[PDB]
């Protein structure tokens, strides 16, 4: 025990007096620093490099001074450590925090956030639960450890299992928060989620009464959202070393939890004050459906804004947080309620893919090829559930059952999809296809079936054909007629909305236009027609007019049509795989969006519609079209970079009954206008569609009928051969 | 430019005090942590340099004979914390706190700066800027 204060003059030794208070230390030692004993020494050196002497000081102190001291909430608690010493010391010693930058706002008075309205209150200790109420466990039932389906009926009904996995199998883990800004946190981990891309990374660690979501952008500042039990206090690391307890920025603690926001943007850098907005997320509800509903909502919203910026900074953070806290909710809900449901465990699998995609691609701007994600949850064993379902498929259906069989099939896949799942997905598409040619709309059940059928077939020279043929089918299904309805759907759904009491889900508003390749829907001709179809939905009409300005209604209709162009077609990775032929040469037009429409043909080939002068491919220029808005149908080849012009020969249609053999099928009936507007892409799928093609207006299918249309309407038939033909009649 | 692996060795403690300032000598440096679990069973001392343009703190080891550079503000904060607990009692301990009090009062201020953009990894690879 030695306290010794020295004064240095020139460098030989120093002039000092050493004062030991209560204990014996080697006194002659001071000629050499007190390394010998297990005790640590401290040396403060003040030297002005003018060669000026300054002064120094020393205290040798003992070793022990560095050593520290219904749902059960008292079993696995959240305990903050005092310092790095008994904890993970690596990131704290090695951080550039406080040296290069600071994770916290420089102004301490901006640290304390206000509590949001939607945040939990004494009367609502947890949050707001969504209306399709979580089914109560039947009184008699006993719950198995894990979740399993041994039968087909299991998916339709509710399947229950115990949340005990949370309390029994768990791991105590130390957590270093962002940039070592706060001392570590011991917690019992119920799960983790990782989402990565080119332009973004988000790490989500979740445990009993605990969540950490680390959110980072290549183009933006990182933030961490930490959730602790309200009774818990976190300690911020700061420059001034003598202040022992300071609270990292955040709002006041609530009934259930306390939330902390680490990272800058609180005082200034945020576009608005969303600080209190994002912090409120974990305290807004325990219903995972609630957060995901809000996620799907901002998803659609930002895809309309896709034009100006590849990256939406705010929306990225938001949808990230939402995704994260939903897993926090779900885990914490099960713990609190002692049980779980099968739908819940399956749903988060699909939600973790579909939302991450939109998060990284559209939100972060990253290349879709590099979008990946991983989840590890103790109450979830997806790979076991996969094998269970794999053996289920391996041993007539209504759209409802199909929607459920496909959803769970998409939710659990490692990339291995059961053959009969695909077979079901195909049949769903085609059945919707034959439906949509006679009728211009789809009910919410139909859309959900289409959605999952698509995601299954585009999931992964066999599977390649599925990608091409579905993109073909999606494109055909999307007509001028349907697009106006489909956009009205998205608009109506967003118009009448209840974040508080109801779920919003994208598959409920879906349509083939979201899965097609068409960039022409934002063209004035269509957007204008959309506006004129608004009063046909009087409720939606009144909502729009009583808030949005007449000018803004156009923007609205433009912005919703945008979704159909940007959802699939704008993704290059989807194109590059299923239509490499478009990209084969020095071709710019693909990425310059000069290709308005893309029509996959026999392998190695696809048609194209371009407004400009085509620099490649076999070119059919329709000459009846207005010159200022030209339509050039172009047949592209993978191995052929040559540029030529074809002749459109004309043929006539036989009598519908005349041939039981089908020489027509596989072609595409394209209906356009002399104004340069592309309307209907309809494929001839079956011998019956062919019969309806030969019809004069005795055809059920309207684009095949030159009556409901008008003089401007013209039509052309595209063979997969590359042969383009005019029909007589 | 010139980087720093975070540590040179030293066989004495008189070397560290007379050692130059990484702040002045180099441009960009990297703080480092010793390849040992428990610092206490190893670390023989802590040296603090106040008047450097970017004040620094050195963790010196006897047996290892290595001297590591660590975050000046974070380390001393974690120091004054662990020795400042309610249950801790000593007159020696008070001398530590007496010395640890006005450490950064003379030297240059801490950063008000915003960090740089880009992804962040977790604790495993300590706050690394990479996405995947």
């Amino acid at each position, epitope marked *: 025990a030695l306290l010794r204060e020295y004064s240095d003059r020139n460098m030989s030794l120093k002039l000092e007096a050493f004062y030991p208070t209560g204990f014996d230390e080697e006194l002659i030692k001071s000629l050499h620093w007190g390394n010998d004993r297990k005790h640590v020494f401290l040396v403060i050196v003040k030297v002005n490099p003018t060669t000026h002497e300054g002064d120094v000081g020393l205290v040798i102190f003992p070793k022990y001074l560095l050593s520290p001291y219904r749902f059960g909430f008292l079993s696995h608690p959240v305990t903050p450590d005092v310092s790095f010493f008994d904890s993970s010391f690596a990131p704290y010693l090695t951080t550039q925090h406080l040296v290069a930058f600071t994770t916290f706002p420089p102004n301490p008075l901006v640290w304390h956030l206000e509590r949001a309205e939607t945040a939990a209150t004494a009367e609502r200790p947890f949050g707001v639960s969504l209306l399709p109420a979580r089914p109560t466990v039947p009184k008699n039932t006993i719950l198995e450890h894990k979740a399993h389906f041994a039968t087909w009926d299991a998916l339709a009904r509710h399947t229950f299992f115990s949340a005990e996995a949370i309390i029994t199998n768990s791991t105590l883990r130390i957590h270093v928060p962002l940039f070592g800004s706060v001392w570590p946190i011991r917690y019992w981990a119920t799960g983790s989620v990782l989402l990565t891309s080119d332009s973004g990374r988000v790490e989500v660690n979740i445990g009993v009464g605990f969540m950490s979501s680390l959110i980072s952008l290549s183009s933006g500042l990182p933030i961490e959202l930490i959730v602790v039990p309200h009774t818990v206090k976190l300690n*911020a690391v700061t420059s001034d070393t*003598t202040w022992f307890q300071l*609270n990292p920025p955040g709002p006041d603690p609530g009934p259930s939890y306390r939330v902390y926001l680490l990272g800058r943007g609180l005082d200034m850098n945020f576009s608005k004050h969303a600080t209190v907005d994002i912090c409120a997320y974990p305290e807004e509800s325990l219903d995972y459906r609630y957060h995901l509903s809000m996620a799907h909502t901002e998803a659609l919203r930002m895809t309309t804004k896709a034009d100006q910026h590849d990256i939406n900074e705010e929306s990225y953070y938001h949808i990230a947080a939402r995704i994260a806290t939903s897993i926090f909710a779900l885990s914490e809900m099960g713990r609190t309620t002692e049980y779980f449901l099968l739908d819940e465990i399956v749903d988060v699998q699909y939600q973790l893919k579909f939302l991450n995609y939109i998060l990284m691609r559209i939100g972060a701007g990253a290349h879709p090829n590099t979008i990946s994600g991983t989840s590890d949850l103790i109450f979830a064993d997806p790979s076991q559930l996969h094998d269970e379902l794999s053996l289920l498929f391996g041993q007539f259906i209504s759209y409802d059952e199909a929607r459920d069989q496909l959803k769970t099939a998409y939710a659990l896949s490692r990339g291995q999809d059961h053959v009969n799942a695909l077979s079901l997905a195909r049949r769903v598409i085609m059945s919707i296809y034959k439906g949509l040619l006679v009728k211009q709309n789809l009910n919410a059940t139909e859309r959900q079936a289409l959605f999952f059928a698509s995601m299954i077939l585009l999931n992964f020279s066999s599977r390649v054909l599925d990608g091409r043929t579905t993109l073909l089918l999606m494109t055909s299904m999307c007509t001028a007629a349907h697009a106006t309805q489909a956009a009205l759907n998205i608009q109506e759904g967003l118009a009448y909305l209840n974040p508080s009491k109801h779920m919003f889900t994208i598959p409920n508003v879906y349509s083939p236009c979201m899965g097609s390749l068409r960039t022409d829907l934002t063209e004035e001709i269509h957007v204008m027609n959309l506006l004129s179809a608004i009063p046909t939905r009087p409720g939606l009409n009144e909502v729009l007019h009583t808030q949005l300005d007449e000018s803004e209604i156009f923007d609205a209709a433009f912005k919703t049509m945008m979704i159909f162009t940007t959802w699939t077609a704008k993704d290059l990775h989807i194109l590059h795989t299923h239509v490499p032929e478009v990209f084969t040469c020095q071709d710019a037009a693909a990425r310059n969006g000069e290709y308005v429409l893309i029509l996959p043909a026999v392998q190695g080939h696809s048609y194209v519609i371009t407004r400009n002068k085509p620099q490649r491919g076999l070119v059919y220029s329709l000459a009846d079209v207005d010159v200022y808005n030209p339509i050039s149908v172009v047949y592209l080849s993978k191995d052929t970079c040559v540029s030529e012009h074809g002749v459109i020969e004309t043929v006539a249609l036989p009598h519908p009954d005349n041939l039981k053999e089908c020489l027509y099928c596989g072609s595409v009936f394209l209906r356009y206008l002399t104004t340069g507007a592309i309307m209907d892409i309809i494929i001839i799928d079956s011998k019956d569609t062919e019969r309806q093609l030969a019809a004069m207006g005795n055809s059920t299918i309207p684009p095949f009928n030159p009556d409901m249309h008008g003089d401007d309407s013209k039509a052309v038939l595209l063979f997969p051969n590359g042969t383009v033909v005019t029909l007589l009649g | 430019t010139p980087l720093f692996f975070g540590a040179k060795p030293l066989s004495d403690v008189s070397l560290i005090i007379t050692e130059p300032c990484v702040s002045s000598v180099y441009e960009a440096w990297d703080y480092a942590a010793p390849p040992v679990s428990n610092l206490s069973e190893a670390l023989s001392g802590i040296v603090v340099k106040t008047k450097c343009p970017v004040p620094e703190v050195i963790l010196w080891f006897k047996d290892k004979q290595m001297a590591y550079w660590t975050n000046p503000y974070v380390t001393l904060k974690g120091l004054t914390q662990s020795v400042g607990e309610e249950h801790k009692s000593g007159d020696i301990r008070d001398a530590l706190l007496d010395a640890l*009090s006005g450490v950064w009062v003379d030297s240059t201020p*801490s950063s008000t700066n915003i960090p740089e953009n880009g992804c962040v990894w977790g604790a495993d690879r300590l706050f690394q800027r990479v996405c995947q």
Partner: antibody
Amino acid sequence: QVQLVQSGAEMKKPGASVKVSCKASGYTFIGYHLHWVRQAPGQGLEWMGWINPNSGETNYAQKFQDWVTMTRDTSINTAYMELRLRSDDTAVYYCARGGMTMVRGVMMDWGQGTLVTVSS
Amino acid sequence: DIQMTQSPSFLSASVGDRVTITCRASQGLDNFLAWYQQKPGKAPKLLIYAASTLQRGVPSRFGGSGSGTEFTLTISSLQPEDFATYYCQQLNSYSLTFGPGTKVEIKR
């Protein structure tokens, strides 16, 4: 040794304008805020406001808001306080260093004070 | 603007006693409060910077405790040198308010 020397002492008639100076030492001037607190005879303490010696920015109390101005000089490490005397302003004026960068309001070190008398 | 209350306003005690001064805030100050010692004719001196923490160099006889709206300063063993008036101060706000102070004399 951190020290602050104020200067020196003076008397000014009502309606005038007075300047008090604080001479820094022992610490980094740019790195810690400067606070002003005045004390009437036989009365308690009243916080007038603070100034960031680096930023130059000032924070004032409502009572002194239109009646006071605070300024510094980064070179000689001095801070200045200029007040318009309403004749109720007779007091001793102190300047003090904020000792905590992340917590506002902690006066770690004080000056020796300057008595200002207001009379005709 | 938070108003601060101190009780007692005045007290006198004897050497060796334990003096307890109290501080009251209009609303929750959480961790942030200070305690100052002003001798007659001299400048204020900081005692307790956080609610509970003793400034290095200040005698161990001085201590503090509190949270929220209520804080208490305690002199463990009173000495003749302790004659002063003691103030409490709000910390970490745009407006920093002082307690009215507590006069402490010494009985012989």
